[PDB]
């Protein structure tokens, strides 16, 4: 059985091909102690180990905006994934990895060198994340907008053919929303600064934030009452209350100028990607807009995306946003489907092909 | 039963001799994918298959101006015609094919070699398209002006005898009108460039274009109001509006200088063909001018042809333009009549005659 | 009832003895197609059939200058005459044929062999055409000037006796006038060249040409005004206008030098024929000059003949030109009278006399 | 010195009487621009000027089949001839013009009106072209077959006397052969349609076409090998190859049915012209058959004419075809000889005789 | 003195007629602040002002693909051109403007309305850009391939006459190459996204990119060494290094499939434009292929164009690419020559003609 590892910027999702859900889901973090030990202790902690001891750790993400910036810590996470989470020998199973489009070429080549020389996997393959999300929905036509912690990208596919010239990629994703929520929480006097407190803000974001259907009407509602106020208990028992920050944080996905970015929102990025495609396939892309990733899990984002794209598209087009309830695992689920196909078993890059063609075989 | 295949530049019309209408009518196109497949797909698409997937295809016509330029794609269309459209075994039926006059000799010889060596037809015959159109109208005397996608030709026939020295042929037909409509649509800011968008312009031409009775009076009407403006919805919901382009495009049939051509219009070509005939038969040709082909399906072309030929012919002649409502299928209908005649069953070129006389038997 | 067939160079006039007019009058032509048939058609056309389809035919006269030059086509005309025009069985009726004087001996012998061996007529007789014209006028004394399409001949007869030494024959007739009209029509830019266009010129000649009383005065009248101009509409609606060609064409009958001929005009030929007769019978020939044939049907030819012969004859002679209005059929009418006489029934050449005396019985 | 202008349908040959060759030889064409000028250009081009710029011009011949159809363009060619080519004042020299026999009377009268009222020539004369060709050969007896671009005519002359009744004229000449070569070049896929491309086909005809001695044997030779194939480089570097079209095009001179014409070939036209002459002069005409004009410049036409006339003439006659190597200029050379004769100086039509006798003096 | 304004998609080149170089050359951009001012600042910046402050601006091009999309910003650029750059009163000088062929009709009419109603110019004229480039080279015959930031178009001209039916236009130009360089720079981890960073990529393109003579040989050279690597210092001191991207970016001009476009390269577009012209003028167009515009300023593009057209043209044609070193200003230089011609002073459209004929006078 093949191993499917979906390693975006924020999470590591691993499991076996053929299953319907990842077996191991943990944060893609490496924590190191920032104090002195006095008791007569591991040197570093990975994943949920680092998340539970984060009070005395400095947390580091080895992947930033889809790109591995620390390859030593990236091997710790893969080692922790294989031996501690899945508890398998990686030299016995082919590994299917994922990657965002328009990534540096050296990123995929280093992933290949590590899988073949450090873990000694027999076969290997690197797929595009948005393509796997279309496998998960059981479609061959559609435009996938995948947004995780580091990357947001749109990939249009028609009848199984990708339109690579129409692929768009934004560096605006979940990390920027957490960073923005930290900034607007200072307006109420809540100061979060350390890497451990950044994990608390992300937990606040995932539990209290939502997408407003009309932002200006929602701002006027929050300024005239308190029906939108929600409380949240910090780990030390302190209770914070947030109001319009609940929908102002996800609003940066549609108005990136809140972050000082010049780019377009996720609705205009999806529309611009459709408009780069041929006129004859746009009608099918409008009706098969698929959301994927953890950053699409805000309540009300599918209704907001449909409203915003309807205002950009011609009035005779049928805008249909497909947001399955399991779309946080769509990349992994689609990778599990792909690695189980019989027509895919010739797509593997074996270790022999890597020894005779070098790392350039992965491109 | 014999097979009747009318394969002009634009369309493929196929059926069985004795029927009153073709059973298979599809565009004579071969589409190949111009992108990369990412889903784990045929290598080429023919006819209506290529027309529905044209968003991701490069469309190619194997016949250009009546002459087959790609014999590999021409066999794909004939193979698609026999096995997918008609669903017959071509080695059991004689095949009646059509061809424009004044074509290269090697074009008809290659059609004969393919029908006998690739499809193994028992018998075969290649007829002239304008002659078949006269069978469809139930006449033995008349001048047929047939205009399709690639070729416009006039063939005068008197009492069953053809006047080959009076046959005229123009390379101005439906393809040049579509190409001209694409050019004058840029005046309103509508840009069509790809082969898929050329199919959209042809659809615009067939639905909105018409022949003006007086061109200069029609130009003054369109410049003073908007009663001639029509809208058209593109496949992606965008709506374009055209005014004088509706009659300026078909006007190139009567004024080929709009295309930069030096040749004469279809009215002067018909008149020059009559004037090459003997003086004693011109009166019968004037009264039996038969229109045929898809390019004669513009509204108002019969009234315009009659007006233009009346101005060229002597005032005592009776100009009568015969434009039947089914004249888009006249070549096929006439071929179905001819292949069903008992006096035609000796005109077939059997495979034995082809083996003993070579490909020169077809001439 | 006997059959009377008057077959000159141009026309075939057939009917039954006793009638006052021929029942069948058609051009003595055989037309064959000069193009290729494409419609899935007789091999040749005779008479009015060839005249109506002459646009696609090559027209041939089997009789040239009174002499049959094509005996295969001559049988087609006789076959068409008996079975299609008269609709009789020629093996039941005696046939009276006509011939110009001073013809080759083999011409009359071949007519006899065909009538007895091909059509199996019971009896047969060949008469001289000018002698029959004198029967038609009810005279026994007179000089007959018969002019058709091929031959002009004068035969003087006195009290029922022919003067064979005074018979004159000219090869100047209607064919040469049509040929001359074609030549002088080029002066106005009218080009007639084909055998079908020669039939049009002959129609122009029969409708617009006339004999001028004084040629030089008529030439001066046409050169000073336009009262002599007449229009004529061609079969294709084109209108031609002719002036002095109307009387210049028939003037060749009186001045054969217009045709490059050295012979004398029809007036001097008639006078020379009278002067070869005995002095005692010339006075009766001067008073009984009978015109006959289609070439004598020009308006004003009787007044011109009288004026020209009066200038040649002594001033005390009474010149009387007899030009009956039915003189185009005089040979046939006279043959119908002769074949009905009871004293003629012993002049027939029966088939028994032909079998025992050979073809020399006809001379 | 008198000016000699030989202006047939295709070429204009001009010079001075007494010289042995024309000084100016250029195509009788007038070209007008068929596009729009954008550079900040003459309105029309004549002769070699139009031939070099023919890519952007519509070429028109003012003379068609020996008859001037455009008198405005005919004056442009004469004006270009006098002032640009010969560089003389036409009001100082008498002009000798040429004309085909059996031309419309108004054609010669308009040439006289233009020479006297537009160019103000002192004297003028219009000669028959075939008569001048006999001066060029130094003969007083012979039949001249002159064939140019528009007209083919035969004029028999005996001891200095013309036989006008034996003059024959065909409208089959070089223009019809070029038009026929264009038609049979489509059999190999070579499409020439514009007036500029017609000049290219004429160049192909003059360089590659020849007359086959036996046509059926030559057709069998070309169908069994490739020794008759010749290549020709088009102006744009494209190379075309022609085989049996090299001798099929000139074969229309001997079999006009290839053009759909009913007329006889040039061999039968020459023979029919001799047979219209008196029996006593035919022997001298058989031995002095003179070829003239550009259409007689095909290799092998003299040997073919001799073979074809020998088969028509009695076996005891000596058929001698005189084809001088300079017979393309025979009409001009003979006109230069005639205009230099002292016994011709009274044949000029002075401007005084034209003012007192009108335009009818030229006939 | 007349004003010459060459305003393509990317640059604005302005000056006075008669000069040899534009006086004002600045980017055709309008920048607006995308932040909040806190210092107690113009509302928008044009040209070099916007280019120097682009760090805090959003840069907008009012002309996209040759078509003005923002007429308010287009007036800001013209106002900045007249009053700030040239420092003249536009109501005193006639203005010569430029435009790409096959542009929307309303684009030229709005330019005319603004020049006459907003700037009150006395006279005005709009020329075609490729025609002006032929004035700059001192030629009247040649095919001009002009490529700027928005449009690539070929205009063949022969002897001063344009062939409008042979004009081709591509929407592939400098903007698409900059956009493509941004995409392939992500392969090395260089992320440029904002409109200010797009100006940096364009600067990289103009300094480091070149056209490879053989693309596949150049790709193999770059993959085997580092002799093609060049460094570039960003505005903030960061140094980027690019290898095969130097010639892969300009290669999209010859292989537009790199951009996902179906169209043909600039070499095949030039060849197809020549092949639409008459056969007689193609030889002169092959020898006078003129390059123009900023997108033709890549090193090695003239040698590559000659190599690619030589492979398409017949081997006997002489392909000569004329690439003057000042061809970035050819449109302006040619407009300066045209506006100084005395024969052009009647081509101006005065303000009186605009008031009496409306905006339709410009077409
Ligand atoms: N219920 C939720 N609501 C909003 N955001 C969420 C939710 N769950 C996860 N996220 C965000 O999704 C991001 C990561 O999503 P995911 O696609 O699973 O990870 P990866 O970046 O590895 O692809 C994180 O930044 C996280 O804050
Ligand atoms: N209703 C219509 N009006 C105008 N043009 C038409 C119409 N229908 C078809 N055509 C044109 O006719 C051309 C082909 O006609 P047809 O004779 O059926 O094909 P073929 O070229 O195979 O003979 C096409 O170019 C098409 O644009
Ligand atoms: N009305 C007419 N006027 C002048 N010529 C005529 C007229 N009718 C007939 N002809 C001429 O008479 C010729 C034949 O006359 P006819 O004697 O009837 O024929 P055939 O030659 O058979 O004896 C034809 O050449 C025809 O042109
Ligand atoms: N060498 C040649 N071979 C065959 N045909 C020729 C040759 N030279 C000229 N011709 C033809 O002769 C025709 C004109 O001949 P010419 O008698 O010189 O002109 P015109 O028609 O003015 O009398 C043209 O149609 C041309 O094609
Ligand atoms: N040296 C150079 N090398 C390559 N490209 C250049 C160079 N200089 C300018 N360009 C490109 O030319 C384009 C504009 O050229 P130009 O014709 O001057 O402008 P316009 O679009 O106004 O006609 C820009 O996209 C620019 O990137
Ligand atoms: Mg994800
Ligand atoms: Mg058709
Ligand atoms: Mg008669
Ligand atoms: Mg000549
Ligand atoms: Mg430019």
Residue numbers in the entry:
A (entry chain A), B (entry chain C), C (entry chain E), D (entry chain D), E (entry chain B): 6 to 45, 49 to 371
What's the paper's own text on this?
The release of inorganic phosphate (Pi) from actin filaments constitutes a key step in their regulated turnover, which is fundamental to many cellular functions. Here, using human and bovine actin isoforms, we combine cryo-EM with molecular-dynamics simulations and in vitro reconstitution to demonstrate how actin releases Pi through a ‘molecular backdoor’. While constantly open at the barbed end, the backdoor is predominantly closed in filament-core subunits and opens only transiently through concerted amino acid rearrangements. By combining cryo-EM with in vitro reconstitution and MD simulations, we have elucidated how Pi is released from F-actin and that the hydrogen bonding network between the Pro-rich loop, sensor loop, and R177 strand forms the predominant backdoor.
For the second pathway, we aimed to destabilize the putative R183-mediated backdoor using p.R183W and p.R183G mutations. Actin-R183G and actin-R183W released Pi at slightly increased rates of, respectively, 0.0117 s−1 and 0.0190 s−1, corresponding to a 1.8- and 2.9-fold increase compared with wild-type β-actin. In wild-type F-actin structures, the R183 side chain interacts with D157 and the carboxyl moieties of S14 and I71. As expected for F-actin-R183W, these interactions are abolished and the W183 side chain points away from the mentioned residues. Nevertheless, the S14-G74 hydrogen bond remains intact in the mutant, and we did not observe an open cavity near W183 through which Pi could escape; the R177-N111 backdoor is also intact. Interestingly, in F-actin-R183W, Mg2+ changes position so that it is directly coordinated by both α- and β-phosphates, as well as by four water molecules. Although R183 does not directly interact with ADP in wild-type F-actin, it resides in close proximity to the nucleotide and, importantly, it is positioned in a negatively charged cluster of acidic residues. Hence, F-actin-R183W has a more negatively charged nucleotide-binding site, which may explain why the positively charged Mg2+ repositions in the mutant structure to compensate for the charge imbalance. Thus, F-actin-R183W has an altered nucleotide-binding site but does not reveal conformational changes that would enable Pi egress, indicating that the R183 backdoor is not part of the dominant Pi-escape path in wild-type actin. Although we cannot exclude the possibility that this release path is marginally sampled, we propose that, alternatively, Pi still mainly exits through the R177-N111 backdoor in the R183 mutants.
